[PDB]
């Protein structure tokens, strides 16, 4: 009551070509980053053209709760690249009431973690994993976001 | 605790009150006459101690200290990455209890974690029968460590290995997991040193700290004291005579590193030890950056003239090439002008850097991937290739590395779009000889052939694909015709849409006859085809027919927008072209007036189409990072867009260390 | 190790292979009906167990963790700095053994280190008979620290303290030091937990870490793992949802203070623990700045679309007041903009600042000052006042606080010079009512009464003297002719004249007739009198006779300058007015041509006079900092040097972080 | 022999009215810090200022030792300033031969020590002493330099 205040988030992941949901739920770190950049890769052009607006772009992602699954995990025990949906709640600073929930989904994901903890003293689980959102030639990708607050 | 051994190789008394029993020994060292007055055995004992202190570097007493220049020379084969020689020494019969100990550590490095325990099992039983408990203690410290690593790995395969590696692996037999999960269930590493003989608790106290984890906790805190002093030195602009606070860090970085590798302690493949290496090194590299850029007030030239810049030698290359990750090395680039720093000992760097190339050939060429060894070595391998862009490589050596990075590295840890990025990064410091273009040429041919199945799609983390692979050719070469690509198109018949459009965007490297014959049955004018067709130089000027399609796209995006607004849905498309079109207008590439009908759809669209009425508060300053000079000149002339862009820049440069905003500011707007 | 208790009050299963006994309790927490299915005994046990946890802050399991707003409450009086009320508490009579312990700690805080130990000896003998386990172990853990305090104190008063103080103060009797040396002589703190009974060892394991120094090394390493991360994300533009890594530290920070205060331990006063608070609160106040300034595309504020703004609360002031030396607080002023930060609870704070003040009135108004208390408290007294600039004080607090600083605070730690730097600094976010204008007078008259010493010189380290106090008053209240200062003028005769400096330095404040007294009085012959005379602006020009004095001083400089050059010596004066001399010519004040003869000695001189033949390599980019808004304009108007200045200026703004350079370049030169 | 290299320094302290020798033969930290700045001053009236040279200016010092001096330390055991004499040498990068010396004079240095270095364990001495440069109203002071390299 003196000083802190806390909030909550929630994390789901999924696989395409079926309604399979075999992943974590609750990104403790929940580290998110976005970036754009440029270089001299096009350091010279024939001119009289136009532009590409390359920007490179990149979306880093992190979730750490584990407890993936037993049913689908075991079944998989016997490259669609999966997909991710992200859901969080938004509040009004004036009223502080529940009126809107953030609806976020990403088209492409590809988990790739540093497959070695080897911590000298074993940890209390929570195997943080970093993700990178792939993309194809077609269109869109990156993120598609939906918003509540129809009050 | 009688004396203190300062890290500079000097000694200073702390608690001694009896005879200066440490003092006299060094007094004998300088005097030659007093060496001869000892008996032969004592003369042998004097040499027995003299040789040791030359190998440990305790030079002289602080009261007569001078300009000390300590050496570092690390000789364990694990450090020097000579993975090939290891397989020859192991394939040999030991001759002593000493020899097996070295092998048990070499087996650990090669990731054959299973057999290591067994030979580690042999040593305990055959170490009881001698007076020499050193091997038996350190036998256990390794034995416990390999156990924990076996538990951590096997769990992580079950947990996330299925999705990471795609399939299921069980490198370790089920029985072994049972046996190890039987043996160590009642072992607490803390008590280990306590239960050893009273003799072992007398002589070898120095080996106490390795028992628990406190040794990294006692060293790690000591660094945190230094990092606070060193940062404090930066914001105060002070000066440090004598033994500077920084060089203490470097000695303490190398001194510790020698102990663990030269005495064959397996701990050095653990995360916490990498943590010490990470912060200890980065602080020094940061310190050099500040030192180069001092302002000079009245004194430095008389003291430090002709800057003795920190030279990053070969013994500095491996450490960065081993312990860092790929994100971490990235961060330094945003906080150091590491291009400027000299990279000495350049001849030596080539061998080890070549050493990774040949090994990467072996593991993936053979059917056998030691998936255990795979984990600890790719991440080391990964950083190595990336960091090469600050060291000069010979032609022949550069032939090996390029031959591997394109071909034999798995698609798992370097996607196609990522592969370009690294290759170019090795084009900075090096030119593009005729040999190199042969390799990248082959990669285009091989990847071209595979892209014939109707579902062998491609992904990217850069959105680059094969298109700019050709660009690296023509940006360096000019007349590369790609014979083999000619035979490809010359034999392509019909109805291979993926192969059609794949080499469509590789037009410039093609041949004259193939071009025309390929201009036949070409992708029509699709909007993707339109821009990408422009990306290859085919389209020179927009026709109204070209514009007609552009109007169609804007209409589609608008009808989507009204659906999105009703549903309250926003998008961020990697192929979002709203921003691209509006710029074409501000430079008069498109003349049709209809663009203004769609003002209010995309914020960056409004920034260019309607500069007079644009809401500059909506301006996101990051867009300028996407804008080339020829826009950044034409941005600086417009009346509607000069009065406001200048202000936001001033705010961020003051409010950020982002030099790129500063670079945009000085040259063009001012 | 059966469970794991996160810092946030949440608990997660760690090593339970049996019933979730923790889980049932929290299942019993919300179930009022099930709480009624217990006997009264069992119900009271739950009440004894429930009352403990809520005071320990444990809330509920992680799976059902909702919005947790953990509280913080520090109640230890010493943390509240009520040094007077405890001075009555120690007079009170003892009731219980727990009360005796509470007094023992209070004794130490007041600097009476002598009687503390004896009662630490008095408690220890009577402790066992009540068979209370804890009250013994902490009584000794507290003893050995206040032992070391005495030991480290006695050497310091002998080694340096004589230089700091000038007398060999002896706070501790000879005989007392003997006994403590005897009793503790071979005391190795390590075994002290290894000594207490098995009955003790099973209940009170949790008090173990306080024995060795692993407790202070355990906590710090996490702050190094916590701080290493946050700077990484700070260079990545990342966003963290939920509890940010910085919020973790604050809970950890306040948790440490409570456990290390309310139990009345004495480790608070050592230097090492102060290290923990410095690098913790630095990271929190550092992280605030980055949040206030960065970009977002659309969803950036959609993630945690608010902040704590590091709302700095009352305890946070109490933290920064003690644990930072003046040098440490300055280090933060450079990077962060602490002015921009807001300050809540601006009334509770006011008691603290008067509390530190009104106490200082007690100590040094009386002849008795506990030197031991002076060792600890003067540092806290320093930082508390300096950092008050950012708070909005009340009128009365500004009364006392200005009163104490000038009259009562000892001269040694705070010379007359830096007093100006504090009293001015206590005006920036305030005004100067009449009641405070009166107090500053009372110093000048008191100082006026001090201008009779024969050898006093007003030694200073910032070149500012009580005339500037009067100069400070005028800048706000221009028409404030002094009243008593005039009188000291009139009664004086020319015979005793050392005060001519002070009065003539204070000529701003005099009556019209008193000025007339000065007119016939005083004289002008030397260069000080020129600039001291000019320092008021009294001298509006320079008659040719005045100019001759300027040339005459210069002739003295060359005659030397050849001598040191002939002698191979180089000197850098302190307040070389030649640099000030060069300023006039370029500012048109003197147009005499004879000054060209005097080139080639001072680089700063050359930079102004001879742009035609001035090499720019000898420019010092720190010059421009000390330049005036007008002066920076006049140089900005020139054509000879504007280009070449702009080259040295662009380079330093690029390769440096000093913001002051950044604003200078933009405003005037651009 | 491979890499590192160190150097040395030397300190000298003395009190006016006499040549009372005090010194610390080494100074490992030995931090010398010069600093100059300004925040705001002046009434900005009277039109022509005709001057303005506020530069505050300040010098700090640091040294290390375990030797205060033997004789009058014990004499006074049971405010006339504390002047300092810094001396060291300079080398020529072309030859690296001993040819040049450095002579540093400070006329007014004041001992401003944090007499609260109470540390949690018995250390290896290291009684760091920090100083602030003082300059009277009279003239000159703080710094003067003398150097060898006559050759």
PDB file of N, CA and C in Angstrom, chain B residues 396-465:
ATOM      1  N   UNK B 396      43.560 -16.811 -49.169  1.00  0.00           N
ATOM      2  CA  UNK B 396      43.316 -18.244 -49.039  1.00  0.00           C
ATOM      3  C   UNK B 396      42.496 -18.544 -47.792  1.00  0.00           C
ATOM      4  N   UNK B 397      42.851 -17.919 -46.669  1.00  0.00           N
ATOM      5  CA  UNK B 397      42.050 -18.075 -45.468  1.00  0.00           C
ATOM      6  C   UNK B 397      40.621 -17.614 -45.670  1.00  0.00           C
ATOM      7  N   UNK B 398      40.437 -16.505 -46.391  1.00  0.00           N
ATOM      8  CA  UNK B 398      39.086 -16.023 -46.650  1.00  0.00           C
ATOM      9  C   UNK B 398      38.320 -16.981 -47.553  1.00  0.00           C
ATOM     10  N   UNK B 399      39.028 -17.820 -48.309  1.00  0.00           N
ATOM     11  CA  UNK B 399      38.345 -18.815 -49.116  1.00  0.00           C
ATOM     12  C   UNK B 399      37.669 -19.875 -48.271  1.00  0.00           C
ATOM     13  N   UNK B 400      38.332 -20.307 -47.199  1.00  0.00           N
ATOM     14  CA  UNK B 400      37.758 -21.352 -46.358  1.00  0.00           C
ATOM     15  C   UNK B 400      36.476 -20.872 -45.691  1.00  0.00           C
ATOM     16  N   UNK B 401      36.538 -19.725 -45.018  1.00  0.00           N
ATOM     17  CA  UNK B 401      35.430 -19.289 -44.170  1.00  0.00           C
ATOM     18  C   UNK B 401      34.169 -19.076 -45.001  1.00  0.00           C
ATOM     19  N   UNK B 402      34.296 -18.412 -46.151  1.00  0.00           N
ATOM     20  CA  UNK B 402      33.124 -18.160 -46.985  1.00  0.00           C
ATOM     21  C   UNK B 402      32.556 -19.471 -47.499  1.00  0.00           C
ATOM     22  N   UNK B 403      33.432 -20.425 -47.805  1.00  0.00           N
ATOM     23  CA  UNK B 403      32.990 -21.725 -48.290  1.00  0.00           C
ATOM     24  C   UNK B 403      32.121 -22.442 -47.264  1.00  0.00           C
ATOM     25  N   UNK B 404      32.344 -22.173 -45.975  1.00  0.00           N
ATOM     26  CA  UNK B 404      31.599 -22.876 -44.935  1.00  0.00           C
ATOM     27  C   UNK B 404      30.316 -22.141 -44.568  1.00  0.00           C
ATOM     28  N   UNK B 405      30.407 -20.833 -44.318  1.00  0.00           N
ATOM     29  CA  UNK B 405      29.263 -20.075 -43.821  1.00  0.00           C
ATOM     30  C   UNK B 405      28.058 -20.181 -44.741  1.00  0.00           C
ATOM     31  N   UNK B 406      28.285 -20.309 -46.045  1.00  0.00           N
ATOM     32  CA  UNK B 406      27.181 -20.326 -46.996  1.00  0.00           C
ATOM     33  C   UNK B 406      26.572 -21.716 -47.119  1.00  0.00           C
ATOM     34  N   UNK B 407      27.376 -22.757 -46.887  1.00  0.00           N
ATOM     35  CA  UNK B 407      27.013 -24.085 -47.362  1.00  0.00           C
ATOM     36  C   UNK B 407      26.685 -25.044 -46.224  1.00  0.00           C
ATOM     37  N   UNK B 408      27.615 -25.224 -45.291  1.00  0.00           N
ATOM     38  CA  UNK B 408      27.510 -26.317 -44.336  1.00  0.00           C
ATOM     39  C   UNK B 408      26.947 -25.895 -42.989  1.00  0.00           C
ATOM     40  N   UNK B 409      26.858 -24.608 -42.707  1.00  0.00           N
ATOM     41  CA  UNK B 409      26.226 -24.190 -41.469  1.00  0.00           C
ATOM     42  C   UNK B 409      24.748 -24.557 -41.543  1.00  0.00           C
ATOM     43  N   UNK B 410      24.150 -25.107 -40.483  1.00  0.00           N
ATOM     44  CA  UNK B 410      22.753 -25.537 -40.591  1.00  0.00           C
ATOM     45  C   UNK B 410      21.809 -24.362 -40.758  1.00  0.00           C
ATOM     46  N   UNK B 411      20.641 -24.652 -41.331  1.00  0.00           N
ATOM     47  CA  UNK B 411      19.608 -23.635 -41.468  1.00  0.00           C
ATOM     48  C   UNK B 411      18.955 -23.298 -40.135  1.00  0.00           C
ATOM     49  N   UNK B 412      19.276 -24.037 -39.072  1.00  0.00           N
ATOM     50  CA  UNK B 412      18.577 -23.842 -37.808  1.00  0.00           C
ATOM     51  C   UNK B 412      19.025 -22.560 -37.124  1.00  0.00           C
ATOM     52  N   UNK B 413      20.332 -22.300 -37.114  1.00  0.00           N
ATOM     53  CA  UNK B 413      20.903 -21.182 -36.377  1.00  0.00           C
ATOM     54  C   UNK B 413      21.359 -20.047 -37.284  1.00  0.00           C
ATOM     55  N   UNK B 414      21.231 -20.200 -38.602  1.00  0.00           N
ATOM     56  CA  UNK B 414      21.465 -19.090 -39.522  1.00  0.00           C
ATOM     57  C   UNK B 414      20.465 -19.242 -40.662  1.00  0.00           C
ATOM     58  N   UNK B 415      19.402 -18.445 -40.618  1.00  0.00           N
ATOM     59  CA  UNK B 415      18.418 -18.453 -41.685  1.00  0.00           C
ATOM     60  C   UNK B 415      19.042 -17.920 -42.973  1.00  0.00           C
ATOM     61  N   UNK B 416      18.286 -18.032 -44.067  1.00  0.00           N
ATOM     62  CA  UNK B 416      18.802 -17.583 -45.358  1.00  0.00           C
ATOM     63  C   UNK B 416      19.072 -16.086 -45.318  1.00  0.00           C
ATOM     64  N   UNK B 417      18.086 -15.301 -44.885  1.00  0.00           N
ATOM     65  CA  UNK B 417      18.285 -13.865 -44.813  1.00  0.00           C
ATOM     66  C   UNK B 417      19.429 -13.496 -43.891  1.00  0.00           C
ATOM     67  N   UNK B 418      19.630 -14.280 -42.834  1.00  0.00           N
ATOM     68  CA  UNK B 418      20.744 -14.018 -41.935  1.00  0.00           C
ATOM     69  C   UNK B 418      22.073 -14.313 -42.613  1.00  0.00           C
ATOM     70  N   UNK B 419      22.100 -15.301 -43.509  1.00  0.00           N
ATOM     71  CA  UNK B 419      23.360 -15.684 -44.136  1.00  0.00           C
ATOM     72  C   UNK B 419      23.960 -14.532 -44.928  1.00  0.00           C
ATOM     73  N   UNK B 420      23.125 -13.778 -45.643  1.00  0.00           N
ATOM     74  CA  UNK B 420      23.630 -12.612 -46.359  1.00  0.00           C
ATOM     75  C   UNK B 420      24.319 -11.656 -45.412  1.00  0.00           C
ATOM     76  N   UNK B 421      23.691 -11.396 -44.266  1.00  0.00           N
ATOM     77  CA  UNK B 421      24.141 -10.321 -43.391  1.00  0.00           C
ATOM     78  C   UNK B 421      25.564 -10.584 -42.927  1.00  0.00           C
ATOM     79  N   UNK B 422      25.878 -11.844 -42.640  1.00  0.00           N
ATOM     80  CA  UNK B 422      27.211 -12.162 -42.153  1.00  0.00           C
ATOM     81  C   UNK B 422      28.235 -12.079 -43.274  1.00  0.00           C
ATOM     82  N   UNK B 423      27.899 -12.615 -44.448  1.00  0.00           N
ATOM     83  CA  UNK B 423      28.817 -12.564 -45.580  1.00  0.00           C
ATOM     84  C   UNK B 423      29.230 -11.136 -45.891  1.00  0.00           C
ATOM     85  N   UNK B 424      28.252 -10.238 -46.028  1.00  0.00           N
ATOM     86  CA  UNK B 424      28.566  -8.834 -46.262  1.00  0.00           C
ATOM     87  C   UNK B 424      29.455  -8.287 -45.159  1.00  0.00           C
ATOM     88  N   UNK B 425      29.194  -8.683 -43.913  1.00  0.00           N
ATOM     89  CA  UNK B 425      29.975  -8.153 -42.804  1.00  0.00           C
ATOM     90  C   UNK B 425      31.446  -8.513 -42.943  1.00  0.00           C
ATOM     91  N   UNK B 426      31.750  -9.605 -43.647  1.00  0.00           N
ATOM     92  CA  UNK B 426      33.139  -9.923 -43.952  1.00  0.00           C
ATOM     93  C   UNK B 426      33.615  -9.293 -45.254  1.00  0.00           C
ATOM     94  N   UNK B 427      32.753  -8.557 -45.955  1.00  0.00           N
ATOM     95  CA  UNK B 427      33.172  -7.774 -47.109  1.00  0.00           C
ATOM     96  C   UNK B 427      33.654  -6.378 -46.740  1.00  0.00           C
ATOM     97  N   UNK B 428      33.426  -5.922 -45.510  1.00  0.00           N
ATOM     98  CA  UNK B 428      33.868  -4.584 -45.134  1.00  0.00           C
ATOM     99  C   UNK B 428      35.387  -4.481 -45.161  1.00  0.00           C
ATOM    100  N   UNK B 429      36.060  -5.207 -44.269  1.00  0.00           N
ATOM    101  CA  UNK B 429      37.509  -5.102 -44.158  1.00  0.00           C
ATOM    102  C   UNK B 429      38.240  -5.742 -45.327  1.00  0.00           C
ATOM    103  N   UNK B 430      37.559  -6.561 -46.122  1.00  0.00           N
ATOM    104  CA  UNK B 430      38.182  -7.312 -47.199  1.00  0.00           C
ATOM    105  C   UNK B 430      37.505  -6.990 -48.520  1.00  0.00           C
ATOM    106  N   UNK B 431      38.291  -7.021 -49.591  1.00  0.00           N
ATOM    107  CA  UNK B 431      37.746  -6.830 -50.927  1.00  0.00           C
ATOM    108  C   UNK B 431      37.068  -8.122 -51.357  1.00  0.00           C
ATOM    109  N   UNK B 432      36.726  -8.244 -52.639  1.00  0.00           N
ATOM    110  CA  UNK B 432      35.991  -9.394 -53.162  1.00  0.00           C
ATOM    111  C   UNK B 432      36.783  -9.990 -54.321  1.00  0.00           C
ATOM    112  N   UNK B 433      37.835 -10.756 -54.036  1.00  0.00           N
ATOM    113  CA  UNK B 433      38.607 -11.377 -55.116  1.00  0.00           C
ATOM    114  C   UNK B 433      37.751 -12.285 -55.985  1.00  0.00           C
ATOM    115  N   UNK B 434      38.333 -12.673 -57.122  1.00  0.00           N
ATOM    116  CA  UNK B 434      37.651 -13.586 -58.031  1.00  0.00           C
ATOM    117  C   UNK B 434      37.308 -14.899 -57.351  1.00  0.00           C
ATOM    118  N   UNK B 435      38.137 -15.337 -56.404  1.00  0.00           N
ATOM    119  CA  UNK B 435      37.853 -16.587 -55.714  1.00  0.00           C
ATOM    120  C   UNK B 435      36.534 -16.505 -54.962  1.00  0.00           C
ATOM    121  N   UNK B 436      36.309 -15.410 -54.235  1.00  0.00           N
ATOM    122  CA  UNK B 436      35.134 -15.325 -53.375  1.00  0.00           C
ATOM    123  C   UNK B 436      33.856 -15.374 -54.204  1.00  0.00           C
ATOM    124  N   UNK B 437      33.813 -14.638 -55.320  1.00  0.00           N
ATOM    125  CA  UNK B 437      32.582 -14.577 -56.106  1.00  0.00           C
ATOM    126  C   UNK B 437      32.201 -15.959 -56.614  1.00  0.00           C
ATOM    127  N   UNK B 438      33.177 -16.856 -56.739  1.00  0.00           N
ATOM    128  CA  UNK B 438      32.867 -18.231 -57.096  1.00  0.00           C
ATOM    129  C   UNK B 438      31.986 -18.889 -56.042  1.00  0.00           C
ATOM    130  N   UNK B 439      32.288 -18.672 -54.757  1.00  0.00           N
ATOM    131  CA  UNK B 439      31.540 -19.358 -53.706  1.00  0.00           C
ATOM    132  C   UNK B 439      30.099 -18.863 -53.665  1.00  0.00           C
ATOM    133  N   UNK B 440      29.907 -17.557 -53.471  1.00  0.00           N
ATOM    134  CA  UNK B 440      28.559 -16.986 -53.440  1.00  0.00           C
ATOM    135  C   UNK B 440      27.805 -17.305 -54.725  1.00  0.00           C
ATOM    136  N   UNK B 441      28.514 -17.389 -55.853  1.00  0.00           N
ATOM    137  CA  UNK B 441      27.862 -17.815 -57.086  1.00  0.00           C
ATOM    138  C   UNK B 441      27.278 -19.213 -56.918  1.00  0.00           C
ATOM    139  N   UNK B 442      28.065 -20.143 -56.367  1.00  0.00           N
ATOM    140  CA  UNK B 442      27.591 -21.517 -56.230  1.00  0.00           C
ATOM    141  C   UNK B 442      26.342 -21.560 -55.363  1.00  0.00           C
ATOM    142  N   UNK B 443      26.320 -20.759 -54.296  1.00  0.00           N
ATOM    143  CA  UNK B 443      25.191 -20.768 -53.374  1.00  0.00           C
ATOM    144  C   UNK B 443      23.904 -20.365 -54.083  1.00  0.00           C
ATOM    145  N   UNK B 444      23.983 -19.387 -54.987  1.00  0.00           N
ATOM    146  CA  UNK B 444      22.807 -19.013 -55.764  1.00  0.00           C
ATOM    147  C   UNK B 444      22.362 -20.163 -56.659  1.00  0.00           C
ATOM    148  N   UNK B 445      23.318 -20.836 -57.301  1.00  0.00           N
ATOM    149  CA  UNK B 445      22.974 -21.956 -58.172  1.00  0.00           C
ATOM    150  C   UNK B 445      22.342 -23.083 -57.366  1.00  0.00           C
ATOM    151  N   UNK B 446      22.985 -23.484 -56.268  1.00  0.00           N
ATOM    152  CA  UNK B 446      22.459 -24.595 -55.483  1.00  0.00           C
ATOM    153  C   UNK B 446      21.084 -24.268 -54.921  1.00  0.00           C
ATOM    154  N   UNK B 447      20.949 -23.130 -54.237  1.00  0.00           N
ATOM    155  CA  UNK B 447      19.643 -22.754 -53.711  1.00  0.00           C
ATOM    156  C   UNK B 447      18.614 -22.622 -54.823  1.00  0.00           C
ATOM    157  N   UNK B 448      19.035 -22.181 -56.007  1.00  0.00           N
ATOM    158  CA  UNK B 448      18.104 -22.087 -57.122  1.00  0.00           C
ATOM    159  C   UNK B 448      17.540 -23.457 -57.471  1.00  0.00           C
ATOM    160  N   UNK B 449      18.403 -24.472 -57.533  1.00  0.00           N
ATOM    161  CA  UNK B 449      17.932 -25.808 -57.870  1.00  0.00           C
ATOM    162  C   UNK B 449      16.936 -26.338 -56.850  1.00  0.00           C
ATOM    163  N   UNK B 450      17.234 -26.222 -55.553  1.00  0.00           N
ATOM    164  CA  UNK B 450      16.318 -26.714 -54.531  1.00  0.00           C
ATOM    165  C   UNK B 450      14.945 -26.074 -54.626  1.00  0.00           C
ATOM    166  N   UNK B 451      14.871 -24.817 -55.052  1.00  0.00           N
ATOM    167  CA  UNK B 451      13.607 -24.087 -55.095  1.00  0.00           C
ATOM    168  C   UNK B 451      12.819 -24.466 -56.349  1.00  0.00           C
ATOM    169  N   UNK B 452      12.486 -25.754 -56.417  1.00  0.00           N
ATOM    170  CA  UNK B 452      11.679 -26.294 -57.495  1.00  0.00           C
ATOM    171  C   UNK B 452      10.437 -27.009 -56.976  1.00  0.00           C
ATOM    172  N   UNK B 453      10.454 -27.485 -55.733  1.00  0.00           N
ATOM    173  CA  UNK B 453       9.258 -28.047 -55.123  1.00  0.00           C
ATOM    174  C   UNK B 453       8.223 -26.948 -54.900  1.00  0.00           C
ATOM    175  N   UNK B 454       6.950 -27.334 -54.944  1.00  0.00           N
ATOM    176  CA  UNK B 454       5.856 -26.372 -54.893  1.00  0.00           C
ATOM    177  C   UNK B 454       5.534 -25.898 -53.482  1.00  0.00           C
ATOM    178  N   UNK B 455       6.255 -26.378 -52.463  1.00  0.00           N
ATOM    179  CA  UNK B 455       6.016 -25.946 -51.090  1.00  0.00           C
ATOM    180  C   UNK B 455       7.302 -25.593 -50.348  1.00  0.00           C
ATOM    181  N   UNK B 456       8.460 -25.635 -51.006  1.00  0.00           N
ATOM    182  CA  UNK B 456       9.736 -25.321 -50.361  1.00  0.00           C
ATOM    183  C   UNK B 456       9.894 -23.803 -50.234  1.00  0.00           C
ATOM    184  N   UNK B 457       9.005 -23.216 -49.442  1.00  0.00           N
ATOM    185  CA  UNK B 457       8.982 -21.774 -49.248  1.00  0.00           C
ATOM    186  C   UNK B 457      10.224 -21.352 -48.465  1.00  0.00           C
ATOM    187  N   UNK B 458      10.380 -20.046 -48.271  1.00  0.00           N
ATOM    188  CA  UNK B 458      11.506 -19.484 -47.541  1.00  0.00           C
ATOM    189  C   UNK B 458      10.997 -18.452 -46.546  1.00  0.00           C
ATOM    190  N   UNK B 459      11.737 -18.314 -45.449  1.00  0.00           N
ATOM    191  CA  UNK B 459      11.424 -17.405 -44.359  1.00  0.00           C
ATOM    192  C   UNK B 459      12.536 -16.367 -44.287  1.00  0.00           C
ATOM    193  N   UNK B 460      12.393 -15.419 -43.368  1.00  0.00           N
ATOM    194  CA  UNK B 460      13.453 -14.443 -43.174  1.00  0.00           C
ATOM    195  C   UNK B 460      13.238 -13.737 -41.846  1.00  0.00           C
ATOM    196  N   UNK B 461      14.349 -13.310 -41.249  1.00  0.00           N
ATOM    197  CA  UNK B 461      14.326 -12.375 -40.133  1.00  0.00           C
ATOM    198  C   UNK B 461      14.835 -11.012 -40.591  1.00  0.00           C
ATOM    199  N   UNK B 462      15.008 -10.843 -41.903  1.00  0.00           N
ATOM    200  CA  UNK B 462      15.489  -9.594 -42.475  1.00  0.00           C
ATOM    201  C   UNK B 462      14.629  -9.164 -43.658  1.00  0.00           C
ATOM    202  N   UNK B 463      13.742 -10.037 -44.126  1.00  0.00           N
ATOM    203  CA  UNK B 463      12.958  -9.736 -45.311  1.00  0.00           C
ATOM    204  C   UNK B 463      13.821  -9.513 -46.532  1.00  0.00           C
ATOM    205  N   UNK B 464      14.934 -10.241 -46.635  1.00  0.00           N
ATOM    206  CA  UNK B 464      15.923  -9.974 -47.670  1.00  0.00           C
ATOM    207  C   UNK B 464      15.782 -10.948 -48.837  1.00  0.00           C
ATOM    208  N   UNK B 465      15.865 -12.248 -48.551  1.00  0.00           N
ATOM    209  CA  UNK B 465      15.755 -13.298 -49.559  1.00  0.00           C
ATOM    210  C   UNK B 465      16.851 -13.172 -50.609  1.00  0.00           C
TER     211      UNK B 465
END
